[PDB]
Write an enzyme that holds these catalytic residues in place. Structure first.
Site, PDB file in Angstrom:
ATOM      1  N   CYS A  29       0.826  -1.205   0.000  1.00 20.55           N
ATOM      2  CA  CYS A  29       0.000   0.000   0.000  1.00 20.55           C
ATOM      3  C   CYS A  29       0.862   1.258   0.000  1.00 20.55           C
ATOM      4  O   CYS A  29       0.517   2.256  -0.638  1.00 20.55           O
ATOM      5  CB  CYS A  29      -0.900   0.017   1.247  1.00 20.55           C
ATOM      6  N   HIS A 197      -2.096   1.444   7.071  1.00 25.86           N
ATOM      7  CA  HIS A 197      -2.457   1.350   5.660  1.00 25.86           C
ATOM      8  C   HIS A 197      -2.292   2.698   4.966  1.00 25.86           C
ATOM      9  O   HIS A 197      -2.867   3.703   5.382  1.00 25.86           O
ATOM     10  CB  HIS A 197      -3.906   0.847   5.546  1.00 25.86           C
ATOM     11  N   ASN A 217      -8.761   3.608  -2.270  1.00 24.29           N
ATOM     12  CA  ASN A 217      -8.053   2.458  -1.725  1.00 24.29           C
ATOM     13  C   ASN A 217      -7.420   1.674  -2.881  1.00 24.29           C
ATOM     14  O   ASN A 217      -7.673   1.971  -4.049  1.00 24.29           O
ATOM     15  CB  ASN A 217      -9.027   1.567  -0.950  1.00 24.29           C
TER      16      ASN A 217
END
Ligand SMILES: *[C@]1(C(=O)N[C@H](C(=O)N2CCC[C@H]2C(=O)O)[C@@H](C)CC)O[C@@H]1C(=O)NCc1ccccc1
EC number: 3.4.22.1
Length: 251
Positions: A29, A197, A217
Site C-alpha cells: 500500500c 495502511h 483504496n
C-alpha cells in the site's frame, strides 16, 4: 477553501485520478498510494498521462522505503521518485508501460470472481528492464520528482495542499470494522487493529453534517464504494491527518 472538493472533477484531463488499482496479495500500500498520487501530479503539473509503475517502486526502492510486500514508508517512496525516478507500468497483465504490476488482482475482504487475496506474498525482484516490445529503455523511461515533502498534521494545510497541487498520500490505522466499509463516512467504533495502511486522498466534503476526506483504496473496485471510501475529517481519526506526504514533478 470550498466546503467540498473532488480532484476527479477539478482535473478532468487527468483520468488516473479516478482510477483504482489492486495491490494484490502484498503489503505494498505504501508504494501504491505513492505512485497513484505521483501519476495524478505528473498529469496536473505538465499539461500528459503516465501510469507510474507500482512495480518499480515496490521492487527497486529497497530499505530506504522499508520492506516491500512487508510494508514501507510513504515519505521514503516519494524520495525514491526524486532520487532514482520511476518508469511507467500499468495493471497486472495489461502489458502497458515499462513495468506492469506482476502481482495478480484478488478479492480484498469481499467475495467476487477473482481468487481471494492470500495476504502472503513475496516482493518481486527489482529488474531494471522494460517489458518486451516497449520503448524506450528502462533508464530512458524514468520520471523524476523534483521535491518530496511532508504536510503538517493540519486539516486546512492538507486541504490547501490538495486544492493547489493535487492528491497526496496518507496513512491510517485500519481496524476490522473498516474491512466491511460500503458507504457513508467511516468512523472506527470496533474491531481489532489489522495494521497501518497507506492510501491516496483526493478530496473532501461534508455528508449529513459529517466532514470527511475522499480516499482511494488499492483493493480493486469491487471493495467499498467502487474502490473509494470516505473517512472522518478534522479529528485526526485513526491518524488520517498524521502522515500526509507529497512532492512535485520536475519542471
Ligand atoms: C500497507 C498495506 O498494504 N496494508 C495491508 C493490506 O492492505 N493488504 C495485505 C494483503 C492485501 C491487502 C488487503 O488487506 O486486502 C494490511 C496490513 C492492512 C489491513 O502494510 C503496508 C504498509 O506499508 N504498512 C506500513 C506503514 C507505514 C507508515 C504508515 C502506514 C503504514
Amino acid at each position: 477553501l470550498p466546503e467540498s472538493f473532488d480532484a476527479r472533477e477539478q482535473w478532468p484531463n487527468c483520468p488516473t485520478i479516478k482510477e483504482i488499482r489492486d495491490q494484490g496479495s502484498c503489503g505494498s500500500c505504501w508504494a501504491f498510494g505513492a505512485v497513484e498520487a505521483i501519476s495524478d501530479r505528473i498529469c496536473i503539473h505538465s499539461n500528459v498521462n503516465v501510469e507510474v509503475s507500482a512495480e518499480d517502486m515496490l521492487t527497486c526502492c529497497g530499505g530506504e522505503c522499508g520492506d516491500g510486500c512487508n510494508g514501507g514508508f510513504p515519505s521514503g517512496a516519494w524520495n525514491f521518485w526524486t532520487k532514482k525516478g520511476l518508469v511507467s507500468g500499468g495493471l497486472y497483465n495489461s502489458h502497458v508501460g515499462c513495468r506492469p504490476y506482476s502481482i495478480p488482482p484478488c478479492e480484498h475482504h469481499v467475495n467476487g470472481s477473482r481468487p481471494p487475496c492470500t495476504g502472503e506474498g513475496d516482493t518481486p525482484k527489482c529488474s531494471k528492464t522494460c517489458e518486451p516490445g516497449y520503448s524506450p529503455s528502462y533508464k530512458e523511461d524514468k520520471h523524476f520528482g523534483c521535491s518530496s515533502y511532508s504536510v503538517a498534521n493540519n486539516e486546512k494545510e492538507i486541504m490547501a495542499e490538495i486544492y493547489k497541487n493535487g492528491p497526496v498520500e496518507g496513512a491510517f490505522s485500519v481496524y476490522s470494522d473498516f474491512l466491511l466499509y460500503k458507504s457513508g463516512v467511516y468512523q472506527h467504533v470496533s474491531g481489532e487493529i489489522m495494521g497501518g495502511h497507506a492510501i491516496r486522498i483526493l478530496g473532501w466534503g461534508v455528508e449529513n453534517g459529517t466532514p470527511y476526506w475522499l480516499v482511494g483504496n488499492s483493493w480493486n473496485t469491487d471493495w467499498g464504494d467502487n474502490g473509494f471510501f470516505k473517512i472522518l475529517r478534522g479529528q485526526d481519526h485513526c491518524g488520517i491527518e498524521s502522515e500526509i506526504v507529497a512532492g512535485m514533478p520536475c519542471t
